Design a protein around this ligand. Structure first.
Ligand code: ERY
Ligand code: MG
Ligand code: MG
Ligand code: MG
Ligand code: MG
Ligand code: MG
Ligand code: MG
Ligand code: MG
Ligand code: MG
Ligand code: MG
Ligand code: MG
Ligand code: MG
Ligand code: MG
Ligand code: MG
Ligand code: MG
Ligand code: MG
Ligand code: MG
Ligand code: MG
Ligand code: MG
Ligand code: MG
Ligand code: MG
Ligand code: MG
Ligand code: MG
Ligand code: MG
Ligand code: MG
Ligand code: MG
Ligand code: MG
Ligand code: MG
Ligand code: MG
Ligand code: MG
Ligand code: MG
Ligand code: MG
Ligand code: MG
Ligand code: MG
Ligand code: MG
Ligand code: MG
Ligand code: MG
Ligand code: MG
Ligand code: MG
Ligand code: MG
Ligand code: MG
Ligand code: MG
Ligand code: MG
Ligand code: MG
Ligand code: MG
Ligand code: MG
Ligand code: MG
Ligand code: MG
Ligand code: MG
Ligand code: MG
Ligand code: MG
Ligand code: MG
Ligand code: MG
Ligand code: MG
Ligand code: MG
Ligand code: MG
Ligand code: MG
Ligand code: MG
Ligand code: MG
Ligand code: MG
Ligand code: MG
Ligand code: MG
Ligand code: MG
Ligand code: MG
Ligand code: MG
Ligand code: MG
Ligand code: MG
Ligand code: MG
Ligand code: MG
Ligand code: MG
Ligand code: MG
Ligand code: MG
Ligand code: MG
Ligand code: MG
Ligand code: MG
Ligand code: MG
Ligand code: MG
Ligand code: MG
Ligand code: MG
Ligand code: MG
Ligand code: MG
Ligand code: MG
Ligand code: MG
Ligand code: MG
Ligand code: MG
Ligand code: MG
Ligand code: MG
Ligand code: MG
Ligand code: MG
Ligand code: MG
Ligand code: MG
Ligand code: MG
Ligand code: MG
Ligand code: MG
Ligand code: MG
Ligand code: MG
Ligand code: MG
Ligand code: MG
Ligand code: MG
Ligand code: MG
Ligand code: MG
Ligand code: MG
Ligand code: MG
Ligand code: MG
Ligand code: MG
Ligand code: MG
Ligand code: MG
Ligand code: MG
Ligand code: MG
Ligand code: MG
Ligand code: MG
Ligand code: MG
Ligand code: MG
Ligand code: MG
Ligand code: MG
Ligand code: MG
Ligand code: MG
Ligand code: MG
Ligand code: MG
Ligand code: MG
Ligand code: MG
Ligand code: MG
Ligand code: MG
Ligand code: MG
Ligand code: MG
Ligand code: MG
Ligand code: MG
Ligand code: MG
Ligand code: MG
Ligand code: MG
Ligand code: MG
Ligand code: MG
Ligand code: MG
Ligand code: MG
Ligand code: MG
Ligand code: MG
Ligand code: MG
Ligand code: MG
Ligand code: MG
Ligand code: MG
Ligand code: MG
Ligand code: MG
Ligand code: MG
Ligand code: MG
Ligand code: MG
Ligand code: MG
Ligand code: MG
Ligand code: MG
Ligand code: MG
Ligand code: MG
Ligand code: MG
Ligand code: MG
Ligand code: MG
Ligand code: MG
Ligand code: MG
Ligand code: MG
Ligand code: MG
Ligand code: MG
Ligand code: MG
Ligand code: MG
Ligand code: MG
Ligand code: MG
Ligand code: MG
Ligand code: MG
Ligand code: MG
Ligand code: MG
Ligand code: MG
Ligand code: MG
Ligand code: MG
Ligand code: MG
Ligand code: MG
Ligand code: MG
Ligand code: MG
Ligand code: MG
Ligand code: MG
Ligand code: MG
Ligand code: MG
Ligand code: MG
Ligand code: MG
Ligand code: MG
Ligand code: MG
Ligand code: MG
Ligand code: MG
Ligand code: MG
Ligand code: MG
Ligand code: MG
Ligand code: MG
Ligand code: MG
Ligand code: MG
Ligand code: MG
Ligand code: MG
Ligand code: MG
Ligand code: MG
Ligand code: MG
Ligand code: MG
Ligand code: MG
Ligand code: MG
Ligand code: MG
Ligand code: MG
Ligand code: MG
Ligand code: MG
Ligand code: MG
Ligand code: MG
Ligand code: MG
Ligand code: MG
Ligand code: MG
Ligand code: MG
Ligand code: MG
Ligand code: MG
Ligand code: MG
Ligand code: MG
Ligand code: MG
Ligand code: MG
Ligand code: MG
Ligand code: MG
Ligand code: MG
Ligand code: MG
Ligand code: MG
Ligand code: MG
Ligand code: MG
Ligand code: MG
Ligand code: MG
Ligand code: MG
Ligand code: MG
Ligand code: MG
Ligand code: MG
Ligand code: MG
Ligand code: MG
Ligand code: MG
Ligand code: MG
Ligand code: MG
Ligand code: MG
Ligand code: MG
Ligand code: MG
Ligand code: MG
Ligand code: MG
Ligand code: MG
Ligand code: MG
Ligand code: MG
Ligand code: MG
Ligand code: MG
Ligand code: MG
Ligand code: MG
Ligand code: MG
Ligand code: MG
Ligand code: MG
Ligand code: MG
Ligand code: MG
Ligand code: MG
Ligand code: MG
Lengths: 48, 275
RNA sequence: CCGAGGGUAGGGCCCGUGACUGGGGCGAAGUCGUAACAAGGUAGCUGUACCGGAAGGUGCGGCUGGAU
RNA sequence: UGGGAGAGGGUGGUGGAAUUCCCGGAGUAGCGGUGAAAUGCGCAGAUACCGGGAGGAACGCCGAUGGCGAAGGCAGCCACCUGGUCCACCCGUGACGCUGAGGCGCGAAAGCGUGGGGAGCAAACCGGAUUAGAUACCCGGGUAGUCCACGCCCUAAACG
RNA sequence: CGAUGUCGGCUCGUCGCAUCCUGGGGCUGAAGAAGGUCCCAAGGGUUGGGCUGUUCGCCCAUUAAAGCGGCACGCGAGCUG
RNA sequence: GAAUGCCGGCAUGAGUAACGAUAAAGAGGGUGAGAAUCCCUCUCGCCGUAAGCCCAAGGGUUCCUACGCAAUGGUCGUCAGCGUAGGGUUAGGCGGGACCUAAGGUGAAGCCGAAAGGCGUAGCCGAAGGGCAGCCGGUUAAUAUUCCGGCCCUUCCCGCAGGUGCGAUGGGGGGACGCUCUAGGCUAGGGGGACCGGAGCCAUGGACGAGCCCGGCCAGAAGCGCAGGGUGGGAGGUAGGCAAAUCCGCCUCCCAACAAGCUCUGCGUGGUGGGGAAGCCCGGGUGACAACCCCCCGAAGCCAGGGAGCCAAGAAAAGCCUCUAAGCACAACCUGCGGGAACCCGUACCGCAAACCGACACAGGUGGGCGGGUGCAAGAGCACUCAGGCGCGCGGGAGAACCCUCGCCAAGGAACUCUGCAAGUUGGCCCCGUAACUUCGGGAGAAGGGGUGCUCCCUGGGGUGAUGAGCCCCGGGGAGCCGCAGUGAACAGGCUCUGGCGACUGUUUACCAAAAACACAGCUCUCUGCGAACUCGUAAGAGGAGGUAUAGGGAGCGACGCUUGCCCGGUGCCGGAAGGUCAAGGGGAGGGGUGCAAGCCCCGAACCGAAGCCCCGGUGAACGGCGGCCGUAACUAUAACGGUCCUAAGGUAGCGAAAUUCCUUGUCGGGUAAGUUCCGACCUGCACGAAAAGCGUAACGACCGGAGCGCUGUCUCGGCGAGGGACCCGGUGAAAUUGAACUGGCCGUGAAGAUGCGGCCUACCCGUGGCAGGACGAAAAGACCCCGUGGAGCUUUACUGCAGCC
RNA sequence: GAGCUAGCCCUGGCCAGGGUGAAGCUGGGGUGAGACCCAGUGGAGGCCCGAACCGGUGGGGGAUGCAAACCCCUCGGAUGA
């Protein structure tokens, strides 16, 4: 059947992307939080 | 005169449609239509704030001249009478000797090829717009301003009309389409006559799908729901209201008046409404 | 080929009969009231409508075959 | 050809009286109703009186024992549209007439449909009396309906 | 109760005997035939249908007979539902 | 040593289940240490509206080539989407950007919010919509509308010539629009040819033929032709298009008028440039100077912004044209010609799948285009086939039970069973024919029947063409032939009668319920006069609605028909300027503390004092409710009738053992051989009843009941046959479970159902295929049930608060 | 977190083929004029049959599955909510 993951590069970037995160307070805490943890990636890579 | 159908489908039994026999032009004036941004009943929050809306036919909005005192003393010919999916009435296209073109709500009896006019000097004729204080007492009027220069606000729906009953000072007494008696200011404009397409109320939609064409999604009864949803939810099997019949949000919906009591227009309501 | 008729399927009309049901007629001495005949004690009759245990009543309109 | 009379019919207008309600004033202790009463209404200001407004229906005197229509029926007043009828002349056609199974149409009231209107009246209904009872007569309320438009129904003591 | 699946049916049987039939008897208000009732006897047998989920029961047609109970109201790691 | 403990290691089940669609394989040759599995060939089979092809998304080197086989591949492996290495994606015209706007998003102005932030006009962003310049062939192992060849075209800059009041974010036009049906002419695509081109072939009885086989085109600028789209011309006035205006709009006149003309597209032709089969010979080369012609069918595509009808009334903005304003008229713009300039990113490959989403090379999921031929009435259905792609990454055997899918069956024919569940039957087309009832549409494919192939003969009309032949499409009549059977295969309704419920088409518990539930047109009540009511929000602001009582919100009922009674005492709601109660506040009789005192300070009576509540009315398609005992008729029985008690009023019409009836399988009737169900009645209705609507109702239903016919393996009652498994051999090889185990029956005992205790009986050791009675077998710390001063959802005239409203 | 699912907004796309034959229009009849009748033309509809597509009615299989919802047969809608 149709499952829950239907990859869409534009949907991915526009929802979890770097610019999406900077635009809101909870987003900047996410970025700060993942930067403090030392994540190699702050955001899901999508190829555009 | 409404038009019936033979029962060649179950829904054709009762479906009735307007006769459309007063319409003389069947596509809108390009310079007077604009996109009608469908809402679905959602507000700028994105929330359903008026339930069961959406999915109607696409429409363009015909810009309607609700002032008319824009152009005192400039007559206009009635070029056409047209369909307008945004209101019950029909609309009439006016060609001004000015050269300018506008739409008005089409009054009952208006004929293509007649000249209408607007202003204190105007004749007491169907389609003429005068300030209220210059129409003789007893004249049936429509498209009435509630406040001076604020725009036609009353008696705009197919078949409706307000009637002039008498005068008091700077103010006129109108019997509204609801039968209330309200004082309207004399400098307010009104158009002689009643709105057209009176047959509009005798239309029999005929089937569920036709309501879906008008943007009307299905209504769900409280009794058919669950208590998380509505006062009337729940119960094993069917059930009476079991409380005073209530809206989705708790308030009582049989008789409970809801006009705000101290509202300033109350000084101008002579009598509440009829029937 | 036609063909008595036999068969299959479906219709029309009549007859008889049927739990039950509807009023009808008749029946020396039942029960309830008293509608009509006198101005019958609310003049009567009427077509219709609504209503009531029952006759009837009431409304709307009509007639005189109504009285004094 | 020329005359007249008439609530003949249809449409659009429009006039005053009266009832009801609403507003203002004035005013006070009852009003209403009956056979007698009660219900009901009334100091929370009724009734009775004056000014104002709205709305519906009916059309006083004329009015008659009258008139018109085929019948059912038709009554303020105005205009328009239309039917029938009678009379004078003796002008035209030449028996072109009579009736009329079927047909078609019209057809009081009540009643039905879809809208509108709703003052007064009033089936149903409620209450008050009367009564043995009173699903009545009498009284106080009262919804259809009575009114309009269209469409049905097509009945009668539709009688002379 | 860190689970013993719970009616009926179907299938498959097995056992008891307080025996429905068939075998053997005594008594009889046993003439014969037919029964009635008690005794001995569990080897075998103990039908097909209509109704109801039904067990049971009633009814139809037969039958020598149309037995009554146990086996976790036998049998859902065998089926049904 | 235990915590269904945690982490890890290793066992058991076990050489067991499985090895992922039953579309299918066989052999020869090759390679190699090694071959059912790689490579080549021949044979066979499968898909062919796909299992072939092309785009898009997503994936991200998986592409191509060399070299490998430890691991990955469900076996194998020499192969590979695997390992290693090298190579490979080329654009002014394709797609996106340097263009436009849509929802939405953002947001100078502005507004709002404790902070964070929420809004918001313009403007900006935003596409698979608008707009805009490339077609055919060749080329590589791998890219091509990208490279090359041919023929075309676009924009920008500069210059030249001719022309003109030039000039814009501004005005205007246009862009610019639905659904259904559809005309004319084309094109794509297809069929045929006795014509044209071709390497050949003659078999096995015949055929050297008007034989068989193959193939007979593609692109193309100007012009031209055919078909279409679009489009009045001129003059005068002019206050409207937020300045201007010669433009547009409005008014008058003249002229034109299906036209034509002007313009823009499609199609055809077209210089020119391409391609070009079978077969044969080792992808190539030949064929080949290949031929490239005629007839027919023909789009859903094209002309197109075409036509008609209908109601539900069908984007925006730029490009573009036109008007003028500042300005500028040595300019500028338009037109033709010439030279020059033309950037960024994508391009490999998979793409209904082994490369995407499903943990897997997973029988599932994934949007658009192309989708050939024959026949079957049509078609994208069905069967077989073309191109092209496959045989599904374990095999070889055997021919038990049993299971799955499938075929047949004597006689019977629902006797099966909860139920004809399941499976039979029926089945397309053409003709005849077709009932109650009905809202006149229907019910209807009712039911029920007949026809159906092939040959010959005569014949009617239509399309193309020409009016003919030829081809193609609909038919009619006659005479015959063969079989068991002619929609000979494949696809393709069993029917009827009767009841309940819901009017109907729809909708729903993704993944146990599709229904009688929800919805629905329709009816009623009620709120709402517009800064509407109501909704969301602290607000601003939105929705409502760019709507206005024929409208919008809320509630119930649910097409339609005939209807919807009585109760307003209680709760709600509505009306009521009296009265009664009533908070803060006002008032301040009169008391108090302190000070020597002027003073300061405290308590405080009557009285005035909202809404709400009390109280007076109304109100049922508002919440709701609609009685009890006793007596009575000239047989009995039963009471039309009466008495009395209570009530706010005591259930009307209609319906009734019912989706409701307990006693109940009520009683009677029908249907049956037999009927707890069904249907029709009766009415002492445990416990129908009138918009939580009552009684009906044609048509409709994968709803639920009862009956009949047809027909059957459902059954008496089972038999046989097919394939895929099970079984045997070679390869690979799980699992839950498991205190250890050297693990028998009976009768007892035992915490009450013992392999494990007592007594007896039985029993050599170990496996394999089977069956499920036991191991209170496995799975899941019982969902039932209770307990816990555990939890959560829900309700109200429980408590206490809050929003909101007054 | 609305890349699943639910609703709405904007913009595109899709629905082989057959069958039934509403209004309207035309002609004929009818009539004082009408209503209306007949034929033809027409092509309406939450119309009928049936693929794609969207569903999921009944049964069987599957149940450490091919699959944490699948497979076969059958069945509903298929111009419309
Ligand atoms: C398909 C495969 C599934 O099996 C079933 O569906 C069968 C058919 C259920 O019966 C179904 C069907 C049915 C009718 O039972 C027969 C119904 O009663 C129960 C509730 O579920 C089972 C076995 C249930 O057991 C029963 O649960 C009962 C509550 C108690 C009973 N026993 C202890 C007394 C016990 O055996 C139960 C709980 O689902 C099993 C647990 C372990 C599961 O969750 C497992 C994972 C199942 O999902 C499953 C194995 O995957
Ligand atoms: Mg899904
Ligand atoms: Mg994307
Ligand atoms: Mg995208
Ligand atoms: Mg997106
Ligand atoms: Mg982003
Ligand atoms: Mg976002
Ligand atoms: Mg921000
Ligand atoms: Mg910060
Ligand atoms: Mg790093
Ligand atoms: Mg992040
Ligand atoms: Mg109709
Ligand atoms: Mg009809
Ligand atoms: Mg109109
Ligand atoms: Mg525009
Ligand atoms: Mg909006
Ligand atoms: Mg917004
Ligand atoms: Mg937001
Ligand atoms: Mg939000
Ligand atoms: Mg709402
Ligand atoms: Mg809504
Ligand atoms: Mg309109
Ligand atoms: Mg409107
Ligand atoms: Mg005013
Ligand atoms: Mg309506
Ligand atoms: Mg609409
Ligand atoms: Mg609605
Ligand atoms: Mg509803
Ligand atoms: Mg409910
Ligand atoms: Mg519910
Ligand atoms: Mg919720
Ligand atoms: Mg709650
Ligand atoms: Mg609640
Ligand atoms: Mg409730
Ligand atoms: Mg409920
Ligand atoms: Mg419920
Ligand atoms: Mg209940
Ligand atoms: Mg209740
Ligand atoms: Mg309530
Ligand atoms: Mg409120
Ligand atoms: Mg009012
Ligand atoms: Mg007596
Ligand atoms: Mg008498
Ligand atoms: Mg009398
Ligand atoms: Mg009397
Ligand atoms: Mg009476
Ligand atoms: Mg008083
Ligand atoms: Mg007083
Ligand atoms: Mg009035
Ligand atoms: Mg003479
Ligand atoms: Mg009384
Ligand atoms: Mg008395
Ligand atoms: Mg009459
Ligand atoms: Mg237990
Ligand atoms: Mg355990
Ligand atoms: Mg367990
Ligand atoms: Mg059996
Ligand atoms: Mg004897
Ligand atoms: Mg004897
Ligand atoms: Mg003895
Ligand atoms: Mg024995
Ligand atoms: Mg039992
Ligand atoms: Mg029993
Ligand atoms: Mg015997
Ligand atoms: Mg037994
Ligand atoms: Mg026992
Ligand atoms: Mg047990
Ligand atoms: Mg027991
Ligand atoms: Mg028991
Ligand atoms: Mg048992
Ligand atoms: Mg058992
Ligand atoms: Mg079981
Ligand atoms: Mg069982
Ligand atoms: Mg078990
Ligand atoms: Mg077992
Ligand atoms: Mg067991
Ligand atoms: Mg220990
Ligand atoms: Mg464990
Ligand atoms: Mg633990
Ligand atoms: Mg562990
Ligand atoms: Mg561990
Ligand atoms: Mg481990
Ligand atoms: Mg380790
Ligand atoms: Mg290990
Ligand atoms: Mg092992
Ligand atoms: Mg084993
Ligand atoms: Mg296994
Ligand atoms: Mg497997
Ligand atoms: Mg398959
Ligand atoms: Mg081989
Ligand atoms: Mg071979
Ligand atoms: Mg090798
Ligand atoms: Mg090999
Ligand atoms: Mg090998
Ligand atoms: Mg192989
Ligand atoms: Mg090979
Ligand atoms: Mg990947
Ligand atoms: Mg390897
Ligand atoms: Mg290997
Ligand atoms: Mg190696
Ligand atoms: Mg491997
Ligand atoms: Mg694998
Ligand atoms: Mg490559
Ligand atoms: Mg640039
Ligand atoms: Mg912050
Ligand atoms: Mg954006
Ligand atoms: Mg382009
Ligand atoms: Mg080109
Ligand atoms: Mg090369
Ligand atoms: Mg020059
Ligand atoms: Mg210029
Ligand atoms: Mg346009
Ligand atoms: Mg438009
Ligand atoms: Mg568009
Ligand atoms: Mg449409
Ligand atoms: Mg063809
Ligand atoms: Mg060409
Ligand atoms: Mg001007
Ligand atoms: Mg074009
Ligand atoms: Mg070649
Ligand atoms: Mg050559
Ligand atoms: Mg298409
Ligand atoms: Mg077009
Ligand atoms: Mg816009
Ligand atoms: Mg200047
Ligand atoms: Mg200069
Ligand atoms: Mg120029
Ligand atoms: Mg650049
Ligand atoms: Mg490429
Ligand atoms: Mg697929
Ligand atoms: Mg595809
Ligand atoms: Mg692949
Ligand atoms: Mg996942
Ligand atoms: Mg595979
Ligand atoms: Mg796959
Ligand atoms: Mg066919
Ligand atoms: Mg295979
Ligand atoms: Mg396959
Ligand atoms: Mg094998
Ligand atoms: Mg074997
Ligand atoms: Mg198979
Ligand atoms: Mg066969
Ligand atoms: Mg047989
Ligand atoms: Mg039979
Ligand atoms: Mg038979
Ligand atoms: Mg049966
Ligand atoms: Mg049955
Ligand atoms: Mg069959
Ligand atoms: Mg067939
Ligand atoms: Mg018939
Ligand atoms: Mg019949
Ligand atoms: Mg029938
Ligand atoms: Mg019937
Ligand atoms: Mg009929
Ligand atoms: Mg037929
Ligand atoms: Mg037939
Ligand atoms: Mg024949
Ligand atoms: Mg043949
Ligand atoms: Mg033969
Ligand atoms: Mg069929
Ligand atoms: Mg339904
Ligand atoms: Mg339903
Ligand atoms: Mg119903
Ligand atoms: Mg109905
Ligand atoms: Mg319904
Ligand atoms: Mg449908
Ligand atoms: Mg479900
Ligand atoms: Mg569920
Ligand atoms: Mg689920
Ligand atoms: Mg299911
Ligand atoms: Mg359900
Ligand atoms: Mg269904
Ligand atoms: Mg539902
Ligand atoms: Mg209704
Ligand atoms: Mg209403
Ligand atoms: Mg709120
Ligand atoms: Mg705040
Ligand atoms: Mg708005
Ligand atoms: Mg209804
Ligand atoms: Mg309905
Ligand atoms: Mg409903
Ligand atoms: Mg009827
Ligand atoms: Mg009450
Ligand atoms: Mg009350
Ligand atoms: Mg009261
Ligand atoms: Mg109550
Ligand atoms: Mg009560
Ligand atoms: Mg009644
Ligand atoms: Mg019963
Ligand atoms: Mg009964
Ligand atoms: Mg019933
Ligand atoms: Mg009951
Ligand atoms: Mg019972
Ligand atoms: Mg019985
Ligand atoms: Mg019987
Ligand atoms: Mg009884
Ligand atoms: Mg109710
Ligand atoms: Mg109920
Ligand atoms: Mg019915
Ligand atoms: Mg019916
Ligand atoms: Mg249905
Ligand atoms: Mg159904
Ligand atoms: Mg049967
Ligand atoms: Mg039978
Ligand atoms: Mg069998
Ligand atoms: Mg076999
Ligand atoms: Mg061996
Ligand atoms: Mg091995
Ligand atoms: Mg291996
Ligand atoms: Mg041990
Ligand atoms: Mg041991
Ligand atoms: Mg052992
Ligand atoms: Mg043993
Ligand atoms: Mg014991
Ligand atoms: Mg024991
Ligand atoms: Mg032992
Ligand atoms: Mg031991
Ligand atoms: Mg011991
Ligand atoms: Mg022992
Ligand atoms: Mg021992
Ligand atoms: Mg032993
Ligand atoms: Mg073995
Ligand atoms: Mg075995
Ligand atoms: Mg066992
Ligand atoms: Mg245990
Ligand atoms: Mg066991
Ligand atoms: Mg056990
Ligand atoms: Mg636990
Ligand atoms: Mg527990
Ligand atoms: Mg549990
Ligand atoms: Mg529970
Ligand atoms: Mg317990
Ligand atoms: Mg406690
Ligand atoms: Mg405790
Ligand atoms: Mg607790
Ligand atoms: Mg709680
Ligand atoms: Mg997605
Ligand atoms: Mg379709
Ligand atoms: Mg279709
Ligand atoms: Mg289409
Ligand atoms: Mg079609
Ligand atoms: Mg026709
Ligand atoms: Mg027409
Ligand atoms: Mg349809
Ligand atoms: Mg059909
Ligand atoms: Mg089946
Ligand atoms: Mg499962
Ligand atoms: Mg499937
Ligand atoms: Mg199938
Ligand atoms: Mg269909």
């Amino acid at each position: 059947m149709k499952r829950t993951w239907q990859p869409n590069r534009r949907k991915r970037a526009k929802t979890h992307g770097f610019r999406a995160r900077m635009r809101t307070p909870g987003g900047r805490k996410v970025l700060k939080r993942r930067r403090q943890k030392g994540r190699w990636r702050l955001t899901p890579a999508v190829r555009k | 005169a409404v038009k019936k159908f033979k029962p060649y489908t179950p829904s054709r039994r009762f479906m009735t449609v307007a006769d459309f026999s007063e319409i003389t032009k069947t596509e809108p004036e390009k310079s007077l239509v604009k996109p009608l941004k469908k809402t679905g009943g959602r507000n700028n929050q994105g929330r359903i704030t008026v339930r069961f809306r959406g999915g109607g036919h696409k429409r363009l909005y015909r810009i309607i001249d609700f002032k008319r005192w824009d152009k005192v003393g400039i007559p206009a010919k009635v070029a056409a009478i047209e369909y307008d999916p945004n209101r019950s009435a029909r609309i009439a296209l006016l060609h001004y000797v000015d050269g300018e073109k506008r739409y008005i709500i089409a009054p009952d009896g208006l004929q293509v090829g007649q000249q209408v006019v607007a202003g204190p000097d105007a004749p007491i004729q169907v389609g003429n717009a005068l300030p209220l204080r210059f129409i003789p007492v007893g004249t049936v009027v429509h498209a009435v301003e509630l406040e001076p220069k604020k725009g036609a606000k009353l008696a705009r729906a197919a078949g409706t009309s307000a009637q002039i009953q008498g005068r008091e000072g700077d103010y006129v007494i109108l019997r509204l389409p609801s039968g209330e008696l309200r004082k309207v200011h004399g400098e307010c404009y009104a158009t002689v006559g009643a709105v057209g397409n009176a047959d509009h109320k005798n239309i029999v939609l005929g089937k569920a799908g036709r309501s879906r064409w008008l943007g009307r999604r299905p209504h769900v009864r409280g009794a058919a729901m669950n208590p998380v949803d509505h006062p009337h939810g729940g119960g094993e099997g069917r059930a009476p209201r079991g409380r005073p019949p209530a809206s989705p949000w708790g308030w009582q919906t049989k008789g409970l008046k809801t006009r705000k009591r101290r509202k300033p227009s109350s000084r101008f309501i002579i009598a509440r409404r009829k029937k």
